[PDB]
């Protein structure tokens, strides 16, 4: 119903539409019920044999069309049973959708809101909406820097609690100090706190400013001194 | 806080300095010295090797502890060669 309504707003009214669906795990549980009603034998994990296709039928209905000024964008939400990606619901979904945004129990239990972990998270068409004309000219360049520095900071953190604080080179210690400051101030904004794109980008610089000018090998001479504090 | 254990003739010169010098001769009370020498925080203890073959157990026990710093020394006659022993097996044990 919603997708048909969304298609009625975009393709026949020229509007940019955003669709949000919740829950998608509940959709499957109900999809299973009418299959046993038809006495159809389930394919895998108790879910019917057309689950992947049935998902694609209502997922793959999104995007622009040639000649028309419409737009349909979907953000389907699903609860992975017991935090597992290999489960049929989020696994099969991955073969259809481009990317994924994953929330982490460890983050939410640490007070992170929203508890989004960016490492397993992914957007396959992210570079299409970055760069001058759509966003700031350092968007792509910055993004990879914060990303690589986070992993390194997390690895510095894990070695710290096993070998002590002193075993770290004090710039691996600042990578660690970076990596928790990164989660507490950048990732954690609040469920009612809006952040415009520009406010987010220079925020990264403010955090990248912790790191000296020597390690930032993903950014070029135009942008590094045009934006860094 | 420094203690020393051994033969009076070789060790009493240490008494010129503030060293609680003993003259222990026993296999077990040498430990008893070292044990009371353990609950008082004497940083270093010097030991004539002649006395160390008596109570070898007690310096293997505190070996993993920092205090006391148990040290083998030759007396006026000579060492028993505890240096040749403990530096040889300790280097090979790790590597």
């Amino acid at each position: 119903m919603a997708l048909t309504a969304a298609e009625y707003l975009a393709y026949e009214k020229g509007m940019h539409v955003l669709v949000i669906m919740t829950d998608m795990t509940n959709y499957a549980e109900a999809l299973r019920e009418i299959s046993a009603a038809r006495r159809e034998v389930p394919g895998r994990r108790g879910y019917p044999g057309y689950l992947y296709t049935n998902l694609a039928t209502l997922f793959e209905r999104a995007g622009r069309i040639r000649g028309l000024k419409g737009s349909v964008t979907q953000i389907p939400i699903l609860t992975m049973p017991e935090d597992d990606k290999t489960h049929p619901i989020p696994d099969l979904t991955g073969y259809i959708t481009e990317g994924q945004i994953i929330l982490t129990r460890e983050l939410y239990k640490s007070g992170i809101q929203p508890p989004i972990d960016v490492l397993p998270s992914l957007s396959r068409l992210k570079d299409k909406g970055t760069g001058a004309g759509k966003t700031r000219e350092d968007h792509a360049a910055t993004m990879n820097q914060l990303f690589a520095a986070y992993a390194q900071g997390k690895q510095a953190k894990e070695l710290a609690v096993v070998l002590g604080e002193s075993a770290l080179s004090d710039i691996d210690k600042i990578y660690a100090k970076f990596a928790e400051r990164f989660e507490n101030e950048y990732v954690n904004q609040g469920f009612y706190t809006n952040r415009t794109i520009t406010e987010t980008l220079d925020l990264g610089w403010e955090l990248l400013a912790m790191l000296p000018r020597t390690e930032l090998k993903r950014i070029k001479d135009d942008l590094l001194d045009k934006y860094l504090p | 806080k420094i203690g020393v254990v051994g033969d009076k003739d070789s060790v009493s010169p240490f008494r010129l300095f503030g060293f609680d010098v003993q003259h222990g001769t026993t296999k077990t009370e040498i430990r008893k010295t070292i044990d009371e020498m353990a609950k008082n925080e004497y940083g270093v203890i010097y030991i004539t090797e002649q006395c160390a073959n008596l109570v070898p157990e007690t310096i293997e026990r505190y070996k993993g502890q920092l205090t006391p710093a148990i040290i083998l020394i030759p007396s006026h006659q000579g060492t028993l060669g505890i240096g040749l022993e403990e530096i040889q097996n300790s280097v090979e044990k790790a590597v």
């Binding site: 070998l163 002590g164 002193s166 075993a167 | 806080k1 420094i2 300095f17 503030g18 060293f19 940083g43 270093v44 920092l66 205090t67 710093a69 020394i73 030759p74 000579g78 060492t79 240096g83 530096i87």
Partner: peptide, 29 residues
Amino acid sequence: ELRQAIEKETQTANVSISVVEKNIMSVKV
């Protein structure tokens, strides 16, 4: 080299110490 040296010198032959124990992660030094 300290040990052997010590041996020779010893054989031919208020004052207390304070030992703060520094650290290198696992053991203290």
